[model samples]
Target chain A: FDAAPIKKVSVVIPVYNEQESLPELIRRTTTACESLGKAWEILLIDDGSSDSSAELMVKASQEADSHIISILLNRNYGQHAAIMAGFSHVSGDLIITLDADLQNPPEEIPRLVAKADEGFDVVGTVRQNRQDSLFRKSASKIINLLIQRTTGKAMGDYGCMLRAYRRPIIDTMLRCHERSTFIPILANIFARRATEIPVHHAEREYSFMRLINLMYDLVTCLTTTPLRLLSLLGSVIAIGGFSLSVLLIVLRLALGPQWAAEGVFMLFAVLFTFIGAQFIGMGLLGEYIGRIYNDVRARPRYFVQQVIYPEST
Target chain B: FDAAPIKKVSVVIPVYNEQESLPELIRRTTTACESLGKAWEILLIDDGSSDSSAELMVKASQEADSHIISILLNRNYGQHAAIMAGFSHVSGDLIITLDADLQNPPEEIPRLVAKADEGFDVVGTVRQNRQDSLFRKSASKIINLLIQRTTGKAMGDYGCMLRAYRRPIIDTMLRCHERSTFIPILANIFARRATEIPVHHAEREYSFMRLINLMYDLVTCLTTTPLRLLSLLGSVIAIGGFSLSVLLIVLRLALGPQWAAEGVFMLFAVLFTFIGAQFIGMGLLGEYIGRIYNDVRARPRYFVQQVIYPEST
Candidate 1:
């Protein structure tokens, strides 16, 4: 009956100003992992939190069970960077990523791992009974829809930090060193077989513009739909301008000098609009160039200030 | 004084539809290297030439001395991709890249390498007495100016492929896997210390559209100036709109209902123009996202259909 392989799991949590939540998070994670009957480790990444979060993480790593590790980044390179930095230090057969906030209950990790066990390389989670406000929920829905359309991958929750991946998927992901990475979207694309499990969601500790920014990042990093839309818009406007000008010229010829004078404002309007679109199209091209520049600059995503491991140096 | 370090060199040339130029180019390159008395290898990258270029390159590699090699790519990935593909197979202490067309004289390779020996990681070239049409010369000037401004590296010739780099610089450059790379600008950035030497230039075998496209790629990949310009334009337009609307409102009150009606077209025009700009900005974001997606996909830059090296496989 003992046919399944032994699984060693590594949980990477990006912590940012989560001093109040760290102790409870660590305690719950420890208990949850202990009950699963599999060896487990948790990595708390301190993403240059301005608060006492870094200090607390170091203190927790020292006092907690031998499975806990703390990595302090030199500066806040963002959540995805922190996750990527933690990914480098992973030493497990399975990897799970969860937010530092208590919203994603650590207890649901085993469920995600279980989903992974069922031949899925990537196991995402759909938060059940999400406690976010209506605005947050609607925004998330739109973002998820955009991601699904762009990547051609049906994902239940595009913003859910609670996720599990097998070793190969993690290895593939680590190999991708893009400066701007939307982890959830890229993970789905890279994973050969992926599924989502319903996981319980709790009330938020923090929220707002960050979610919107994440949505923006997701849409921009995952799709070229916007660029295609611009090309379509430019073409449509150009055609419209040419046809409108011709019609206006005929109107001027029939209606005389006064009519032509009256239409001057309209003509200028059309000209400026098309010219504006062209400028923006040029600008759009520039944005992509900017991103390519950043990528080519090839700066390190995150610099580790210190690493406190389960086993001492 | 007699114990200066010996430098082995590798010359990388990307061949498109350059069947006419191959025989002469190979002969000149062989003579140049032989006269310099340095161990040298020439890598001819046939970037999916639709002409007899590929056949001639294979024939040349087989018949020429052991220093000549031909790499046949599955498809045309572009000039930069071909160069990057060549960078991987270099087996020398120093690497030099030049166009396959006779415009960039193979004799310049010795001058570039000599510059590299002067403690420079990268040695770029300025085409002395450029032999090109006035229009082409002006376009090249604009591209060089833009490159200098964007990269903060004063390059005399942004389009000149006659450049040499030390092994360390080449190794560092190969590590940068950006999907859209402008090698001249990027090499300068990576090299830390670089210099330019004057080299003879010849009239082109090919001209026009490719140079313009390359200029566009260089500006887009190396700078965010265009995006920043858009943002500035958006701000200026916003201020102008606000002020103009206020002025129009006062004019409407003083003049009559007819004046207000007259201003409707202008208002709509302004509104549409700003909306268009916003759409393009979103599209610009999408463009960058598309590039990041491509980079993250981490596909091989080029697929080698065949590699005819110095030694038989």
Candidate 2:
């Protein structure tokens, strides 16, 4: 019901163990696109799900509209990799991405698009009245906070996968060959202009481990905040040790050797702390090198077992 | 003449404050290339040098053969950027890069190419009969060791820039758009097969600071060793603190309060060490994010104020 128009749209969903939700997700997505009066395609990426997700993709592509494309990956390349695989195949003016669990209702696809149509290159969604458990909600909040601080973009909710992007943003994103990428954070950084829309969020079907892993991925894959913090901490520890040593030396000179008998304990403390800080700095360097190694390895980000297009049907 | 038959060769030299050495460098490079009997071009990149380097470039392009192209960058984007800028302009089957300081003798260029022609995608030069100061030599050894451990590619020397690459290696390198790149390490990883040839080393015209910065760049820009070190250190510190706390509690229970009276110092030591480790980990994360930020910012890796090609001349 929004004013701005897009001729063709592509919706990408990275599916992992979501067999129960696939059919409904496809139906609602089709209905939503049909209602919008536009040519659309749904990209269901099977990220090596252990469940019957691959079979579901095949069945959906056969029974559903021809626009339903199923991309089966050889192994579990994670959500970001799956999304990247899907991004490579999308041929639409506007691209929207949402989860396969139906937590991000397919009906909200138009709302995300409506926001993008208003001239924002990226349109991120904020889940309204979230139905996740208290622990999950708090953990998500912390993740959102970390992402906000790290990326310096004040997106309210990163957990909500329901988002839309104009073609240009996708082009820029596709150009990035980094082995690990967090799409929402990267989108915010690359998007020329961005906005957020409130959307209905359903109860979660996924386990807690996924959210935990998501948080880890969000922090480690996207930001260098940790390494910078390590450097800063090392400097602080070195300065503190230097100052404390000077103070203790001055005290020992003034108070005599007997008074300084216990000085060995303080010295040991400072030594261990400084050494620990040095190791941390070295560790940070190692982490960056490992990522560079991964990038330089130039391994394909994701390998596709098969790509089922609409024409295949 | 070298037995290797290279159709066309491109020599890229990143110049900083090498005004005194440019004329000699060009002459030696020209002599070496002409002896090889190949159609060749030499790219002299002016990396925002404050010296009379730009004038030298102009004079070299005018007086020397038309194959000598002078590329003026708008700002000092570092050696890697300069090389990348030069890489884009190169139209040669064989590409070689060396420092403008003439320390890496231009006479060795043929040797590098000969090795590259022997079915090796990349041929890195190893400096033999070292001529640098002892400090410089040792520092370079440390850098080589770090790179070797991090990349698991045991190149005899990474400090020498007299390296030759086949067209495929350069093509893959040009495809990489990462903001920060350590060319040698990345080249080693991307090149299908690589070998190193020994070349006579000469005294350096550049100051010690450049070598030091090069070492810093080698470790910080190319490797995740630092970040991984931080993560590992953090884990170790956390475990040590937990074990020490338990030990202290046991000591207090068995030997009474007076014996454990000085436990506060150990506690403080553990606390600061653990906190420092945590900050370091966070800092490491920040470092990676900062790089990603730079990458996603999509700023041109290097801006060319002017490109002086043979055709332009």
Candidate 3:
């Protein structure tokens, strides 16, 4: 039992082909919320699982005091999309997100809420002693590192499926119809204050190749540094290529036709110019891309701090 | 002037450094709206003018029977940003937009509204006999052609600011905090049915260079086809380059080291491969850029066609 009070607590879990895990997931999840001493509910999103997961979610919600609210998505749009489906249905003051694999122990749900009730707008988790291979763990650290450099936010674990968010952050994210963003990463951007705690971990089913695919997917969707860097690289390369062409042309003008090995080097110069110009064009495109991102984020354009009418005068 | 009646009409005009033109703009614009046969108001936004335009707007609003509302932006955020500022302040059943140049002829305001009320969600105008140079006219045609091909929307005059939008369209655009989109182009997307007509025109002060600059500014801001095409071009180039490299290497392998003319061609082959790979990478970036655009536009993700709660059961 924690001291800070919340009107209600909502736990969201995304299920995809987790038939064997559903029963224990429901029991432990409810028991954890039951201890919170307030109105609480669980949002289970069956992401068009081919297994019997959808039926199980529906049955539990119907029989278990209506505490488990099952959401049925038409088709699987991956984990992030499923979580987004759950987010739209939640009504709790404190919203917590967990993985359906039970890798994030369901008992940790109370801890997540208690942390948010301590005035944290967002609370993420860093899995303690993860039951994964070294490759997976190290890869996660690299993702966290890149995100750290790109956004300057030091999120300890970008891969952890256990996370918590306050109502305000959830509402702000709901305002965005982002198609392919990790919810935890999206929430961190919206939160005024964010922190993460270590949570118990267990073995999970994220395959070797799937993790790599996810890394590629999540890293590209989560940040624009790659785009910015490509544009930047093109700009400097353009300048270098421009200078190189000038130098090579001057040698041809002064040296006359006797430079024996000049064709190969001059060809290199021509190549640089083409590549450099291409990069600058890409850079211009990058500028627009960033503008579109900013535009789509739909951040406030202007503030109407005061509107005085003739009646006021 | 026409049969359809509107509850209230809002005329939005953005002001920059137009001190000399303010009085006439206000007079002709107000007179045009006053003739619309119903309640009407004007919103003039002072886009951080260095002249006396701000004071004139404020002064007019105070004296004009509360029929004119002035919005003061902190800085010159360009025409689009200033217009966005006006979009947020409107309270009319029908919203109309006009330019401050007097070039669009304020006398045509009723005509725009009449057309929109004829079951159109958006009404744009084409200048009847543009007072611009041949180069300007031809360049505008190019813009129209590209936009037609890109969005497949044949808007007659994207350059003309004299336009009309119903309350529903205005409300939808207001929900977007887009920083650099042309209001007409933005409206065309949100509109269920859009059409344009010709309006009287006069000489304007958009300088030769400024039109070119605006072309560059608006074209890039309005679409992502450039990025997609860049990526597509890169993909094909990459495939061709890969083929060239394979053919060149095969020749080298089959004929052994005495091929004198092979060096230059092989180098050309190398250049293509490098350029091709770069293009493909750019294509991947474009995909992400498109996703961000859709997200920021915040279109609907799914429809919960039915929600069966436990109580219903």
Candidate 4:
């Protein structure tokens, strides 16, 4: 019998002012990866942090085992963008993305890989002991439902940063140069076979306001639902308005134009709300058009001014 | 001036079922282009004509002087897209675009080239003997004004097809990849120093309705004016709506509530108009979003299934 071809795994961790958390993260990540009996590499991206983040990364790549690459972008291009930079540089059969928060354990990496090998292209993580009260949970449930209605992909835990991507899925995402995409949500669309696994969670949890912000981002980034809703709402209102206009004519004929003459004041109030909604719809349309224009330009996603390569093989 | 380098001129004529017109049209264009005393070539693009257009083009290219190259697109991709196909394959220092209708005389080709070389990248042609009546002229004038206001490039005559372009401008337009663009108006934006010169016009003139349609297409393509107008109108209506609300409240206080009760029937009509406008605005927004989406996909502009090379040197 022939031997099985060894597989490679690439781990990307986006760092922003995480000078204190670097050593323990490196140790835990390397130890877990070493136990996996395959080739592995870790990518640590310094997203223009103001602290001493790059110094440790340089030392680690220059002196430590040749297992990690350091990428330093010009400035803080935010988390997803930093991850995109890592993706451009990755050399792996599979890519695993996680944040530097270190709230989730690195041991869960194998679980994602194990699940992925069983015919799944995407393996999403759900944190166990997710520390949030009823209020957060209730609002979050509503937010998830809204996103699902728009994106048509029901993500179980959108807030979790730990995720696995097969090479084909990664290649597809690289082709779409959307400027402000929610990576996990966009990923689900291309991941025909996807599953979620529960991982141990620490006490840290995202704020309610952040979740609300995410809801807006996720829905807007995934589809043209908001733009479409405006058109559908317009036609809907037109039908209702027509019905009301006919009814009002009947009211005037029956209640004697006496009914028609006095409610001009209420007419003004009705106009105010209609006008407000129209304005809101217009604003949302422009916002998306701007994003579309920005995306069409297809400019560089991120600029990396420096890179630290691993010294050993 | 550095010894005047003899710039090459390329003429693109998009043909659609113009079998009979092709003979005299070719005779006239080659003669006019030859008079320019510069290296030049003519591109005849058969935009999938249903008639004997491609057959004549094949014979012309194979037997005629090494002056015309024949391009056959897969199907009828419309006029501007056919021109785009020409632009992609052209090897000219300066380019001129005109139709195969032969309404605009090829004799004016030299005038355009002469004007273009005089420190201008674009030379727009205004056809003489442009026959149209008062109603057609007035509506046409309004359409022109609307396009100018939106595109911010006041084109003296938007209907003219005979125009000249420098390589720089053509390359810029090729980069944009806007699916549905009004080429003449788009050319004006990139032409830093652009002006119009009168060219000999024939009896043929575009219909008034066609001009109105062009206004919509040109404004929608060149800029995000319609999208911005939606947002601006929304705010303007909100302000007016607010003023009306305040006055109505005051009137209700003065008229002793009798004024308020009788006006409910009118409230429906007022809401009807407000709602109608909002609906109209939403439809426009969706139209633009669809266009933006189409452009972002960045698919192939046109497919040339075949090409006929000119024979004689």
Which candidate leads the pack in DockQ?
3
Sort by DockQ, best first: what order?
3, 4, 1, 2
Predictions ranked by TM-score, top down? 3, 1, 4, 2
| Per-residue lDDT over A1-313 for candidate 3, one digit per residue giving the tens place of the 0 to 100 score | 1224578988888889999988888888878878888898889898889989988887887893578888998998877777778888999888888878777788877787777777777788886655667876677778887767654466887767777777767776777775656666666554446677887687555666777777777766666556656656877887887788788888778877666667677767767766865866676566666667656555434434244566544
lDDT of 1 by residue, B1-313 (tens): 1113546888889999997888888889889988877888889998899989999887887883567888999998988789889999999888888777677777767677666667676777887765768887787777778767655568877767788877766775677777776777766654445678777777544446766666666665765445535544655666666666676677668986664366664565466446546644644564464455445534322111111111211
lDDT of 3 by residue, B1-313 (tens): 1225567888888888899998999888878778888888888887767888888878888884668887876444467777777877788888888878777788988888788767887788887765567887777788788767765577777777788888877776776555656666666666657787877787655776666447655766566666667667767777877788788788668977655657777778777777867776776777786667666666433323356678844
Query: Each candidate's chain B TM-score?
Result: 0.73, 0.71, 0.80, 0.76
Candidate 4 docking quality: incorrect, acceptable, medium or high: incorrect
Question: How large is the i-RMS for each model, in angstroms?
Answer: 17.2, 17.7, 7.2, 17.9
lDDT score at residue A143, model 4, on the 0-100 scale: 61
lDDT tens digits by residue: candidate 2, B114-179: 676677767877766766678867777777777676555667776568888777667666766766
Give the per-residue lDDT of model 2 (tens digit) for A1-313.
1225678999888888987887788778889988877888888887667888788677667662356877876445468777887887888899998877776778877777666667777788787765667887777777777766765666787666778887767777776666555778777765557777777666644566666445655665655344445566566667777777777777768986654345665675477557657755666675665476346424234323356768754
Which portions of model 3 miss their true places by more than 4 Å?
A1-266, A281-285, A292-299, A310-313, B1-7, B64-66, B74-78, B131-135, B205-222, B235-271, B300-313
CA shift of A67, model 3, Å: 49
lDDT of each: 0.69, 0.70, 0.73, 0.71
* Candidate 2 ranges with C-alpha deviation above 4 Å: A1-4, A15-22, A46-66, A70-78, A131-135, A150-152, A205-213, A257-313, B1-257, B260-313
Error of 3 at B204 (Å): 3.4
What is candidate 3's DockQ? 0.16
Candidate 3: Cα lDDT at B155: 74
**Candidate with maximal lDDT:** 3
